[PDB]
Amino acid sequence: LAAPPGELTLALTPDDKTLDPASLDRALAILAEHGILVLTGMLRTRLTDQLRTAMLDDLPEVLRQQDVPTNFVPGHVQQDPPVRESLLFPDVLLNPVVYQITHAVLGADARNAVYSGNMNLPGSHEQPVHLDEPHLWPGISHPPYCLCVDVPLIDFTLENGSTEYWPGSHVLNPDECYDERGCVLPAELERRRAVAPPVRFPIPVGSVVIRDGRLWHRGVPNLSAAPRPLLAMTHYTEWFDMPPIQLPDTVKSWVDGSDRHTHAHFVAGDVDHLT
Ligand SMILES: NC[C@H]1O[C@H](O[C@H]2[C@H](O)[C@@H](O[C@H]3O[C@H](CO)[C@@H](O)[C@H](N)[C@H]3O)[C@H](N)C[C@@H]2N)[C@H](N)[C@@H](O)[C@@H]1O
Ligand code: NI
């Protein structure tokens, strides 16, 4: 593919603060059927440039750690973006279109409880197909309780490790489908591949991906010369237990008391996001 598939894609400008009813209906219809929705033209260059720069500037500190935290296989580094006041942007944390969709899917009490990132390094390995958040009981069909909000901080290409997604996989929860790490058992993977094979496609910087937290996906090798930073948030239902995001009380004024909710603990000092 050369672009996000039309059936998963809704196009916007950074000026759009709400989806009209027909746009919201299509957004919800895509998330319900495919478990993944690509929103193009959401974020200004000004914001993505500063976040990209901050995360690449922090990568050296991350690679110096005694144990570099990875997801599954070499080269998929867990990296939190900074929570400096200067790098906490309302249009990223409290995006009005993102929360319009998450409010409609999860309810008005839904809250962001993740402010993290995935730095995919040059020469990274293939992750096993997994879900980031499990089904709440084995062998049970239930609606979503969490939505991953993924912000690419550079153009994602097939070369630099755009994520493999398995459309419609978010509703699959037969017995002995998942292991303790959330990896899909091989038997189920092959059966699914027959009827609905995975897709991988470019995603331009400025885009936002909203997906069911239970969607099957894998990180894949970054074959470029440059690390591929993703900023990651996750909206949960009110009743799902999550630790709070540590934020500086310098952002409490606009974060706390907003009707788009964040599970946050506000600290007096600077926060150390890296450990
Ligand atoms: N899309 C955002 C992020 O999603 C995932 O991070 C998740 C964990 O996966 C999840 O853990 C779940 O899975 C574990 C192992 O399967 C189980 O032990 C655990 N009980 C179960 O809650 C935590 N609750 C929250 C964390 N933010 C990815 N790792 C990461 O790449 C990505 O940035
Ligand atoms: Ni994952």
UniProtKB/Swiss-Prot annotation:
It catalyses: kanamycin B + 2-oxoglutarate + O2 = 2'-dehydrokanamycin A + succinate + NH4(+) + CO2. One of its GO terms (biological process) is kanamycin biosynthetic process. The keyword Oxidoreductase applies. Pathway: Antibiotic biosynthesis; kanamycin biosynthesis. GO terms for molecular function: 2-oxoglutarate-dependent dioxygenase activity. It is an enzyme of class 1 (oxidoreductase). It comes from the Bacteria. Its cofactor is Fe cation. The keyword Lipid biosynthesis does not apply. Its EC number is 1.14.11.37. Pfam families: PhyH (PF05721). Keywords: Antibiotic biosynthesis, Iron, Oxidoreductase. Belongs to the PhyH family. Mediates the conversion of kanamycin B into 2'-dehydrokanamycin A during the transformation of kanamycin B to kanamycin A. This is Kanamycin B dioxygenase. It comes from Streptomyces kanamyceticus. The lineage of its organism: Bacteria, Bacillati, Actinomycetota, Actinomycetes, Kitasatosporales.
